[PDB]
Amino acid sequence: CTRFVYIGENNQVMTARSMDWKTDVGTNLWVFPRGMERSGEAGPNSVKWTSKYGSVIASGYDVSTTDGMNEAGLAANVLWLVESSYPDYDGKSPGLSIAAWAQYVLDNFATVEEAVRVLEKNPFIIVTATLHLSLSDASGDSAIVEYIDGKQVIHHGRQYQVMTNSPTFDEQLALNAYWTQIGGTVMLPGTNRASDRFVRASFYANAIPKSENPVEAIASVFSVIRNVSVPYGITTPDQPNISSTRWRTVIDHKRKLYFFESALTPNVFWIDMTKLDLSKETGAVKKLDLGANQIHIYSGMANESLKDTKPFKFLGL
Amino acid sequence: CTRFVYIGENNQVMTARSMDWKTDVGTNLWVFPRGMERSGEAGPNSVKWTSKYGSVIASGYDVSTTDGMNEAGLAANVLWLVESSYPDYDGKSPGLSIAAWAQYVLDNFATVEEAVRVLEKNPFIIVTATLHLSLSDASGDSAIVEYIDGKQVIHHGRQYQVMTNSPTFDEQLALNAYWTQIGGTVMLPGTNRASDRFVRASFYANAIPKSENPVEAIASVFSVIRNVSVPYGITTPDQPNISSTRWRTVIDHKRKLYFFESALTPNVFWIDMTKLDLSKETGAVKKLDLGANQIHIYSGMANESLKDTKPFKFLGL
Amino acid sequence: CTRFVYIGENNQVMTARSMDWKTDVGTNLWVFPRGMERSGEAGPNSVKWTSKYGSVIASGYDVSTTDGMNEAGLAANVLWLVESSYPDYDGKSPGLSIAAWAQYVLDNFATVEEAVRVLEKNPFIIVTATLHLSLSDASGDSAIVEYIDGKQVIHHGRQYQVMTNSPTFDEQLALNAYWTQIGGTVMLPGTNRASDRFVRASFYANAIPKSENPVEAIASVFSVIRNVSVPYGITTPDQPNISSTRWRTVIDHKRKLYFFESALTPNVFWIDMTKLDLSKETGAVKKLDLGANQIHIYSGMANESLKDTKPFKFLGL
Amino acid sequence: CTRFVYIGENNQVMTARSMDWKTDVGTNLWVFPRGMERSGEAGPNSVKWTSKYGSVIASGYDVSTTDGMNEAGLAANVLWLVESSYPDYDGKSPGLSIAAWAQYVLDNFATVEEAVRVLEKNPFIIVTATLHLSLSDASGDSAIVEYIDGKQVIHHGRQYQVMTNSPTFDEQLALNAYWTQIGGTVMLPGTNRASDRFVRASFYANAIPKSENPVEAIASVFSVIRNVSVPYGITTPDQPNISSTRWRTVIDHKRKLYFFESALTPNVFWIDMTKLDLSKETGAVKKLDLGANQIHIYSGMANESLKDTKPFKFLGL
């Protein structure tokens, strides 16, 4: 449910995200080394591929990839509670289960441009917790991919630094517009409305110092995504599009770090991709077991708590 | 710089606080068992006392107590950047260095009433960042103690659930007033102005579910104090009363837990007072060394990382 | 319902007011020269007095004085829909019907200080639209007189430039407080809530140029009181304290001009007190007949349309 | 600078407008009967036409038509300080001086649809205060015509009830968007920013009662256009797109009344088109001389103060 990209000097680029949902999302982290053979779980005409890039990802119920980054610095965030209208699936085109959407992207491409160029070819038939896809890279580039009237719609440009789960993206830009005229040190909208979150993220992302110091940038980036999270247990059924923030992620594109934080358990740590073996030859599929509401606590660089496990099967046909 | 008390059912009371300051505050945690003999470090007429309650506290530069709780469930939060006018100190009356103010309170009293009743009768003159004192109890009671026109001024009542560092507390209630007419699901002020923070804290504190489940309450309480923290590195010298949030505390009054979180390092853990030896007979002074910007990471119940250390000397003379 | 004072250089002082009410107020203008003998219409112990200062006033139903000024430059605005608690009237003390309250003040005093000094010592008991009294003078001084818990309460000072007929005056200052921190060119509250009106009036009053040019000042002052009026026919029963603006008044203290404008009829004009005969020796009581909803249109200096009439009898027995 | 259309029952349609500018606009009112032969004052290839419909209009500096209505109920409001990029004028195509733009429209068409169908096919090139054109009808229809990237751009639909001078119209709808989520009785933006004015006008226009009672509707409509006017003398050079409101018009489409009000002089009146002779055979060109800052005061139906005058020459070459 909320995402933004910060761009500092000397390629110090960072993508942060909050997950908002009404319930436990059953998230564990996974490491997938390169050269994995995969199917889109969309019946006999599922798309197939062999991963080119290793990733570290956050699962949706250990049956989907909902967040993550790859060793090339591409980040993917699948946002929940979106206004989608997905296409019908005949069965005759190559199909891709939406649960694997993010994984396909993370496995196959190094940049947002690479990904967008291929996405505009015709092999994006999604199958089908409603979902849209946000992407960012180490160069600071961004894109969002939506389904509106059964059609894939892509916005692509580094100026799209902030994205929310509701409403559609051309609408999000509209709701933000009023606040481009009002200075963010004088007034900001402070509710948990997606528009309000959007505006605060946009203001704070651009106000972060751009000077090279990763510890500082990280500090400022968390503090901002925390600001834009939805407090827990507070929202009422009167506002269906808002949900409590369950967890947060921060992706350090330069240094290849994936930070994770729980709202339900005091639990914050990160995975360092530079110490992972993502090779075909010896790299293992590994899982970090967080447990329900991330009760299993880790801290610092948590790589050593990763355990060899068989990769889960994506949800599909 | 921002503090609020949440009151749930069955004595599930929680006090949360953010520390806002322009720089490192050099904070480490300390455990002080009962029966410690102390001096107020205010020259020959320093007040003296022997602690009646063990505490766990957060230091200011290992030369002051700026935050903490005691085994009876009294909490003390010393807020920074306040509008004070402290009295002059003739050497003649019993004196108390302000660096030990919070400690004196935590050491001597079990409740906010107990503390207010004694402070009313003027047992000392405070001696002298600028600082004011916020207190809360396991019964949900609250008070704030300020110095205005060289005089100790106390507000005392459970209805005073939210306090900021600026301006004076009477003024804080005034700046909040406008927003009592506007529903918090429709609009909230979203900047880092103390008034804005105040208003969001009051709305969210009362919107938290009151149902008995500590893990849920804790989750909702952090998420709210995080919401009212000031994002890191963002504020400019144009607005002198606002400062980046350096860390947060959450005090669980019922279960006697002290949670601590850093903004500069991913570092979150808690101290469980029920597993500490706070006896005069066999209770040691212990310190948890967090290091500059809390670089030393802990997690979960961090009691075992506490180390026997000689207690620091409070600042003043 | 909305009043403000602008203070320019060289004693260019102006008081503006909007009248908000749910229905026709039946207002006509009257001229009362000096030396009129009057009774307070409060039974056998009614206060009695002989006017010292000629006035031009706006009636409430030709049975009360609800607005006006005197030849010395004292202005009185009786605001409607207030939170009053009026005293009981035994019958033993000198009494004054509230319908004549403003008239008594305008007739007897030249300044706000003069008036406050005499009203402090309680020369009468008010006898009972719910009503409170606002005053201003050619020196820029202001006061408001309210009844709270059956007691006369007076606020007196030049700094009280803005008053509403919403909540008690002490509460008005509180609701305004938040907006003293926010620059009025960046954000202002735009609804018809008394607090919102108050805040816009306080900002615009202090932003008007202070350079001596009456035509310009007048233009600015109307434009501001128009801003702060409540649009006609718009308010819903959900907000009982707000009412459509029926008319506006602007008092030029220096030049002794009383401007009047209708919201229900396009009708705007003024009375010039310097061309009226207010002497006891030859001055007549005169009325300008505006009619229901001010259907009788005048323009410019409307003095010539004033007609000799017997003064009305104030309500109350 | 601000315009809106109110639509009541039984064809009770009204267009109101504020004119905002930094200085005197030198406006007088004119009556032009039908059958006037006119040139576009754009050199040898000026467009020519013979008026079909009599109009009453407000001039720019007696050299342009900036506001008005015709006997069929078409209204035209030329807004000032717009973001235009006008086309180059060769000299080869039929040309129309922008000063006569509104007049051409009022003279030739009875409805907004009639006007849009002809303007779509480009009968002329506008020849060139920056100006854009707003139109409304007795049927409640609206359109706005702008020049963006040297191209005529038209928005046409009854939904476009509110228009400002800034920014371009597509951008105006965007800046309004945020406030479609917030109820106008709970919060409205209260500054003089065009967006703020836009939002308040859209809310109040739709909240006006739709009853058939012209005096009431008129009252509400003025009160609203007064609300969205920019107070006089208070804007600073820091905000270049905002200007003091100089005057207002209200057009009663059903009854064919043109109301005019000054901000600089207390002066309000109207022209009744049903009592004008607009025939070619006996109708005279007439002018109502308002004078600098509308110092010449009129009131009520001011028709009798109209004086036979030679029509002015539109600016051009």
Side-chain angles (χ1 to χ4, degrees), chain A residues 27-306:
Chain A
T27 294
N28 297 309
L29 273 31
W30 294 75
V31 168
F32 295 128
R34 59 195 170 245
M36 295 189 64
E37 287 169 4
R38 304 259 203 182
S39 137
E41 300 298 333
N45 253 304
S46 303
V47 71
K48 284 170 163 98
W49 75 96
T50 299
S51 67
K52 272 206 60 178
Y53 305 103
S55 42
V56 56
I57 67 96
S59 75
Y61 295 111
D62 283 357
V63 306
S64 60
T65 296
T66 190
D67 206 75
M69 68 184 304
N70 74 22
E71 58 179 318
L74 183 65
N77 316 104
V78 197
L79 310 188
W80 289 41
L81 257 176
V82 308
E83 295 177 9
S84 54
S85 164
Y86 299 112
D88 270 322
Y89 186 46
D90 48 33
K92 288 170 179 181
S93 285
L96 174 57
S97 178
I98 195 156
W101 195 14
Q103 195 61 61
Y104 171 94
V105 170
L106 287 172
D107 283 344
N108 283 115
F109 311 111
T111 73
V112 169
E113 176 152 2
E114 216 179 320
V116 170
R117 292 298 93 91
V118 174
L119 278 192
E120 55 188 16
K121 260 348 138 74
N122 217 56
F124 51 91
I125 178 102
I126 274 163
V127 53
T128 51
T130 52
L131 302 170
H132 286 160
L133 181 70
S134 285
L135 306 169
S136 46
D137 68 27
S139 79
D141 193 15
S142 327
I144 174 163
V145 186
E146 294 171 291
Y147 287 87
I148 291 154
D149 291 284
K151 294 175 173 159
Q152 185 177 254
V153 176
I154 298 179
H155 291 74
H156 172 219
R158 69 186 42 250
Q159 81 273 27
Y160 302 131
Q161 287 184 259
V162 181
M163 298 154 176
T164 220
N165 63 296
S166 97
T168 58
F169 193 69
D170 273 295
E171 269 167 301
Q172 291 179 34
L173 298 171
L175 302 175
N176 181 68
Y178 178 80
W179 294 93
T180 58
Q181 329 180 281
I182 283 86
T185 58
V186 179
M187 202 52 93
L188 286 168
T191 71
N192 299 317
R193 248 198 303 280
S195 64
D196 291 23
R197 293 194 265 102
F198 193 108
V199 166
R200 282 192 329 269
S202 213
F203 170 72
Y204 289 129
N206 295 302
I208 295 172
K210 287 140 177 231
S211 168
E212 278 180 75
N213 185 349
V215 159
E216 302 266 312
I218 291 279
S220 52
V221 171
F222 274 101
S223 69
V224 173
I225 189 69
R226 293 187 236 262
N227 188 264
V228 139
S229 298
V230 181
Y232 180 79
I234 256 57
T235 330
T236 89
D238 295 338
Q239 308 158 302
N241 287 340
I242 304 164
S243 313
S244 293
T245 291
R246 308 305 306 211
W247 45 264
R248 285 166 283 275
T249 252
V250 176
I251 290 152
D252 190 322
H253 292 265
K254 180 154 187 170
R255 300 185 295 159
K256 317 287 177 180
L257 306 176
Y258 196 60
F259 295 79
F260 182 91
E261 198 191 275
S262 181
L264 295 132
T265 310
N267 192 356
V268 70
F269 54 89
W270 70 88
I271 300 293
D272 191 331
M273 297 196 83
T274 69
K275 297 169 147 53
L276 298 173
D277 174 19
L278 303 163
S279 71
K280 306 181 185 183
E281 289 91 355
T282 60
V285 177
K286 306 198 146 112
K287 179 206 216 196
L288 185 74
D289 184 14
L290 301 174
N293 298 166
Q294 302 84 58
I295 293 159
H296 302 131
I297 298 180
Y298 309 93
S299 59
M301 183 187 297
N303 290 38
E304 317 222 335
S305 314
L306 288 160

Side-chain angles (χ1 to χ4, degrees), chain B residues 177-197:
Chain B
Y178 180 80
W179 294 92
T180 59
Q181 329 176 260
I182 285 86
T185 57
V186 177
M187 201 49 94
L188 286 168
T191 170
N192 303 152
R193 247 198 303 281
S195 64
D196 291 23
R197 293 193 265 102

Side-chain angles (χ1 to χ4, degrees), chain D residues 197-215:
Chain D
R197 293 193 266 104
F198 193 105
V199 167
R200 283 192 328 271
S202 327
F203 171 73
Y204 288 130
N206 295 304
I208 295 171
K210 308 242 191 229
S211 88
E212 281 181 66
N213 184 349
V215 302

Side-chain angles (χ1 to χ4, degrees), chain C residues 184-186 188-193 204 209 216 219-220 223 226 231-234 239 248 261 263 266-268 297 299, chain D residues 184-188 190-193 200 204 208-209 216 219-220 223 226 231-234 248 261 263 266-268 297 299:
Chain C
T185 57
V186 179
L188 287 167
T191 72
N192 300 317
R193 246 198 303 281
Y204 287 130
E216 302 265 319
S220 289
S223 70
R226 292 189 186 122
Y232 180 80
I234 256 57
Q239 293 230 64
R248 285 166 283 276
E261 199 187 23
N267 193 355
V268 70
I297 297 180
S299 61
Chain D
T185 59
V186 177
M187 259 327 280
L188 286 167
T191 73
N192 302 151
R193 246 199 303 281
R200 283 192 328 271
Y204 288 130
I208 295 171
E216 304 264 312
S220 288
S223 70
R226 293 189 186 122
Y232 181 81
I234 72 161
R248 285 166 283 277
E261 199 188 24
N267 192 356
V268 70
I297 298 180
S299 60

Side-chain angles (χ1 to χ4, degrees), chain C residues 218-265:
Chain C
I218 291 279
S220 289
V221 169
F222 274 101
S223 70
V224 173
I225 191 69
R226 292 189 186 122
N227 188 262
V228 139
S229 298
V230 181
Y232 180 80
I234 256 57
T235 329
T236 92
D238 294 338
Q239 293 230 64
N241 297 317
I242 304 165
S243 313
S244 294
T245 291
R246 308 307 302 200
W247 44 263
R248 285 166 283 276
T249 251
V250 176
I251 290 152
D252 190 322
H253 293 265
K254 179 154 188 171
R255 300 184 295 159
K256 316 287 176 180
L257 305 176
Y258 196 61
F259 294 78
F260 182 85
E261 199 187 23
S262 181
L264 278 284
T265 310

Side-chain angles (χ1 to χ4, degrees), chain B residues 194-268:
Chain B
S195 64
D196 291 23
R197 293 193 265 102
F198 194 104
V199 166
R200 283 186 296 145
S202 327
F203 171 74
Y204 291 131
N206 294 302
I208 295 172
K210 288 144 166 37
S211 166
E212 222 206 271
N213 187 345
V215 70
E216 303 266 312
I218 289 278
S220 51
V221 171
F222 274 102
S223 70
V224 172
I225 190 68
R226 293 189 186 121
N227 187 262
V228 301
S229 298
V230 182
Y232 179 79
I234 255 57
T235 342
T236 88
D238 294 338
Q239 35 200 164
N241 291 319
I242 304 164
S243 313
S244 292
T245 292
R246 308 305 302 198
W247 44 263
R248 285 166 284 277
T249 67
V250 175
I251 290 152
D252 191 323
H253 291 267
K254 180 154 188 170
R255 301 185 294 159
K256 316 284 184 278
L257 306 177
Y258 196 59
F259 294 76
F260 182 91
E261 200 186 25
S262 181
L264 278 284
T265 310
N267 191 357
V268 70

